[PDB]
Structures are given as C-alpha cells and as structure tokens.
DNA sequence: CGGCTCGCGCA
DNA sequence: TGCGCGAAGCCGAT
C-alpha cells in the first residue's frame, strides 16, 4: 500500500474490509519507540495516502501485576518520553487501561477509525487479543513486524531445529530487508494521565517488592536509564568501547563487555535493525562483529520463530523427541539436592556460584548471559521434576529480569532445560543427555571468586 | 556423511 | 587463556 522505502513483505493483512474515512490508528504493543519503527512508519504511509492523521494507542493491561516495579517503572518512564516524542511530530498518544479485546475495539468505534495497524509479537496473549479485536471491528486490520530485521513469517515457514539450519535462511534475505529507516513525517491534521497510572500501579506492587533483611529494596534502578534516548547512548558506548573486546570477553561475567541492550530491545525502545546498521558500518574486530551479529540477528530472531510455530513454547511438550525421552527416563533418579521455588528465589542453595548469579538478578535485574545457563541448568539438576524446573525458571525469569516476558527468555530457558536448538551430550544422572555445566568448568574460563565476592 | 553457540587434558 | 578431543542425536544437502 504505497510507499517507496517500504517493503510490502513487512506487513500482512489480518482482516479485510472497507477503509474508513477516519484517522488511522497504530496499536503500539511491542515496539515502544518513535524512530526506527516500521509499524509506525507504515501507519504514517497509510495516513498520507488517505489524507488522514495518524494516532498511537497503548493499552495498559493487568500483566504488570505478575511482574514487579522494576519492569513497570522501566516501561512507564520510557512511555513518558515516548509521549513527548510524538507530541513534537503532532502525533497524539492515547493510553487506555483494561482488556485490549474490548478497549481497542471500543476505541475504534468511538474515534471512528479508518485503518488499524499493530506490531507483531509471537506471544500467546497477543494472538488472543488480535482475534478478539478482529470480531469487534469492521475496518481493515494490518500487522507489521517492526521488531525483526526479516519478518518472522518471511524468514522461515516452519519451526527451525537448530541455528545452523536457520543461519543460511536469515543471511540470504539480509541484503533485501537490511535498509535504512526513513524519517517520520509529522502529521498534517491535528485531531489518561501517565503520572497517575505509574503512581497507582506502584502502590499495587509495593507488597510484592523484593526486600532484604532490614526491609531494604534489593533492586538497583540506577544501572539502566529507561527511554529511547538512553538506549541509543548505551548502543553508542557499546560500539565505541565494548564492541572490540566482545568476541573474546562475552563469556566473562566479571567484565562488563556486553551490549546491555536487552532491556531496551525487549520493550522495543531501540530497533535491532538500527543496531545492526551501525555495527555493520563500524571498523571493529571481525571476530567480535561476527560473534555479536550472530546474537542479535540469528538467536534473537530464532526465538520469535520458536514461539511463533510452537504455541506451547513454555511447556515440556515443546521439547524435541530425544530430550523428552531422556528426561522421562531419568524422572525416578535421585537428586543430590531438592530446592523449592522460595529457596531458589532467595538464593539459599549450597552452590555459592548459583547464589551469586541469583543475587545479580535480584540487584540489577539483568544477570550475565554466561551465568544464565548455569543458573537455569542447575535448577533442573536440583528440582523435583523437569516440569517443576521449567516452572521455576520461567517464574524467576519473568519476575526479576528486565528483559523477561520475552521470546528470547522462553527460547533460552527451553535451550538450557529442554535442549531446544541444541544437541545431545554425554548421558548423566537426573539431567540425562541435556547439556551439562559444572562449577569446575566455570573456574577454567573466568575468575569465579571475583563474581561471587561482587554479589555476596 | 559432515557439522554442530559443553567438560577435560595439556602447553 | 587456548586448542584438540570426547560424547552424543539429527537435520539436510544429496
Ligand atoms: C535461561 C536464560 C534466560 C534468558 N532470559 C532472557 C530474557 O528473559 N529476556 C531476554 O531478552 N533474553 C534472555 N536471555 C538471553 C540472553 O541471556 C540475553 O539476551 C542477554 O544475556 C542479555 O544481555 P546483553 O543484551 O547485554 O547480551 P549481548 O551479548 O549484548 O546480547 C546482544 C543481544 O542479542 C540477543 N541475545 C543475546 N544472547 C541471546 C540468546 N542466548 N538468545 C537470544 N537472544 C540473545 C539479545 O537481543 C541481546 O540484547 C536468557 C538466556 C538464558 C540462557
């Protein structure tokens, strides 16, 4: 539908109907940003063709009760900066509270919407909201993949077994879908408070706050400043200062050599395509560039592939046949230790390395990538059953990780526990043929004592 | 049949 | 640290 720099393969039709005479409405759910947003740019293009203005709507659901203040304040403060950003472009932002299946449907009829566009997310609840919205509206409904460089329905048509199978498919379509982002043209036609929503939600999440012995909060919110402007600053410092040493020090939690982009990438405050755009043009270590590109392009977008083609991505059924048979055969094996969710959450295990990894999670909200595997694999080794291990790993991840409730999390948890996108290894006790990690193995790769002493 | 995102022994 | 090997099941290029 019109546009020169717009790839039609990024947008697909969810519902057909006669185009309305009112302004087009963009349902911002996953990509919370103004710049480098294909969904917002496409919505403006439809608005320009029909000589109507564009408007952005955000529906605040009750999902924040499951999570904590750390994700609520991160998302809410970014939205406050987002509201000012669209105001400079004469784009109004409307924030609702309630079920999207009824709030968005009512808003379309009340505002007399002409075209409805939303971003793409492979989550189960996102599809449920779309189906409820479709039955409640009679206007065209579109969906744009503004999160992945290559659209999820275009990269692959089936669930990918391993990364080596998905590697050639993604890199083959890169020269077409890797382009520059055109500027967002301001609106030509002009036509709840965000502070009150933050205050009300915080009070409802105060009892569930993670506290210390002296009733002191554990979360440290000064590590990551939320917002679109700060996300660019984090990416800028990574390329200039940390990209050169990424390829050799990304497995060292004692060194802050990671991009620290997941909290911004999860909420959509920065575009992964923009990050790839600047990294490809940077003169850095070729090994470091290849290692990082395989992380933000291959494994990041294969998590969407895993969740899109596997509705049970957070279940034992999603595990492949060889993993299920191995885990089932070792169900009756005696575990060395058995810890409950409360003991795992408090970091009260016999392993000081595991406790240190949990302490980093509770304090900063972003545990190091290498220690995340050992954090999740040891849960399986010290749990009643593989189903309980998956339950605890998901619960702790979605509650304390700033990048939690993301396809990158469920795929990562399934990789560590169920071996998704992995292969079989030496047969062992309890864990069976799932990939095994040991405390001594971490000793030969990084200074373990420094990591434990940093987080008690 | 070749190649895959651990621990382990050895410079 | 860095390198080669072991141990394991399976996709897919043919
Ligand atoms: C058990 C487990 C749970 C995880 N939980 C989450 C989660 O809740 N949310 C989340 O976004 N990521 C999660 N990860 C994936 C990964 O650990 C994080 O993306 C990364 O550690 C965040 O730090 P970083 O962005 O600075 O790392 P970087 O090395 O800078 O990563 C760059 C980017 O690449 C992507 N990426 C990196 N590693 C992975 C990976 N293993 N799988 C998929 N994409 C990746 C992310 O978008 C990340 O922002 C989890 C991994 C595991 C093993």
TrEMBL record:
Keywords: Chromophore, DNA damage, DNA repair, DNA-binding, FAD, Flavoprotein, Lyase. This is Deoxyribodipyrimidine photo-lyase. It holds the Pfam family DNA_photolyase. Belongs to the DNA photolyase class-2 family. Its EC number is 4.1.99.3. It comes from Methanosarcina mazei. PANTHER family: DEOXYRIBODIPYRIMIDINE PHOTO-LYASE, DEOXYRIBODIPYRIMIDINE PHOTOLYASE. Its cofactor is FAD; coenzyme F420-(gamma-Glu)n. Gene3D superfamilies: 1.25.40.80, DNA Cyclobutane Dipyrimidine Photolyase, subunit A, domain 3, HUPs. It comes from the Archaea. GO terms for biological process: photoreactive repair; UV protection. It catalyses: cyclobutadipyrimidine (in DNA) = 2 pyrimidine residues (in DNA). Residues 22-152 form the Photolyase/cryptochrome alpha/beta domain. It is an enzyme of class 4 (lyase). GO terms for molecular function: deoxyribodipyrimidine photo-lyase activity; DNA binding.
